[PDB]
Structure 1
């Protein structure tokens, strides 16, 4: 049977490809994670149907501990694979399985160009420049859970001021372009955006380190096969090639 792949529109990972007509099925999509999926389907010899996650979320918990997003789709066995920039986290590992990472990254800062700012520290110890993160994203959770001084402080700011947190990267990137606002997000998106928007830039370096993995329901037989396939793609340099294909723009 074809595998059900849950995913989520997110540049440059998964996008509707441009067309004069209306496309349907898998042919609708293009992007880094679509190329990854094609590589995985070939190596492992499965067929698949792409389905965008209904609630358009990656996956977070509520106060009662219930999951939404692609994480939930896997938990309920409504999808066999999550092929997306799904950040590997301690908490998510308790609910689903991940392949080994296919991409490594970290939290960093998106901000308009040309300022005294050079680091998170510069950002926390001042007040003129607002800053925030996507609400309930892996990046926000990092600041919430942190015990580091400068990040407990930043979490204090972004959690008190109820305009600091944005609904998604799209809105957050809007804010950096219209207001005096710095977005806390993942370095993969920042590199993509700053290659295409020469008025934006990354502030400082990576403040943590993490990876993206293919999500499967806990105990899936495919997890280990996907890990083997990712290792093969690494050996063949195809993750390098795929990244340069979809990260290119100053």
Structure 2
């Protein structure tokens, strides 16, 4: 009766709820994805038990093609739904089902307000403002693997000089953006979380490498179609915009 929902700690999607005493059950967690799960549970009518993915991974394959993370939990039917910022990808779609994306995003540019900079075309042709991405992240992985000429060029730059233009994590990247003449390339959702808290920062340009976060289910699940419908229903009603503004403002 009670569906098992696998998820992953990820701000502001899933966070431990702050409390003065140890909490139990789903009340331990809060965030955008917990609110989304509550709406889904009230549209389709189901009880749910949230369980963090034991290895804290989204889901990738090792050298032998063995899966891990939330994808493996669905593949092995240890979870009925994955309600998380789980990216819809070619390799994953072949082993699990995805709903239509509840959130769409891409690579954009975090930078200061009031600067001539205005696009990815402009950053690629100057060498004064140091620009890069989080080392070993999805954004960096995109630029490194890209066959698109212009993105190969931006990768050559940010990976030059011992890769000094890169940063270890988003936080260190953020602090580098505020403290020095540095422009960060990362997810538009993450940037939007930054611009709301650092009013001296903005988003420059549009999106590269579009993608979406969807709810994952085991292949053959009856909930895939149901959840897709509910997500689009919520989107049409503006409720997803409400949820996002709540946890990002």
Shared fold, TM over 0.5 = yes
Deviation at residue 25 of structure 1 after TM alignment: 1.5
SS of equivalent residue, structure 1 residue 207: strand
- The change in CA–CA distance for 1:170 and 1:53 in structure 2 (over 3 A counts) is farther
Deviation at residue 113 of structure 1 after TM alignment: 4.5
Deviation at residue 117 of structure 1 after TM alignment: 3.2
Aligned length: 247
Superposed, 1:55-74 pairs within 5 Å as 55-74=55-74
Give the stretch that moved more between structures: 33-42 or 226-235: 226-235
Q: Which TM-score applies when normalising by structure 2?
A: 0.84
- Whether the 8 Å CA contact 1:135–1:165 is kept in 2: the answer is no
Q: Deviations over 1:94-141 (max 9, x none)?
A: 23211011122221122345554332233333445141235253x344
1: CA distance, partners of 2:146 / 2:64: 21
Question: Residue 191 of structure 1 aligns with which residue?
Answer: 192
RMSD: 2.6
Question: Residue 207 of structure 2 aligns with which residue?
Answer: 206
Question: Residue 243 of structure 1 aligns with which residue?
Answer: 244
Q: Does residue 83 of structure 1 match 2:79?
A: no
Give the stretch that moved more between structures: 4-13 or 31-40: 4-13
Unaligned runs of 5+ in 1: none
Question: Residue 49 of structure 2 aligns with which residue?
Answer: 49
Question: Residue 117 of structure 2 aligns with which residue?
Answer: 117
Bigger CA radius of gyration: 2
Superposed, 1:210-229 pairs within 5 Å as 210-229=211-230
- Whether the 8 Å CA contact 1:82–1:216 is kept in 2: the answer is yes
- Whether the 8 Å CA contact 2:131–2:185 is kept in 1: the answer is no
Deviation at residue 238 of structure 1 after TM alignment: 1.7
- The change in CA–CA distance for 1:112 and 1:227 in structure 2 (over 3 A counts) is same
Q: Which TM-score applies when normalising by structure 1?
A: 0.84
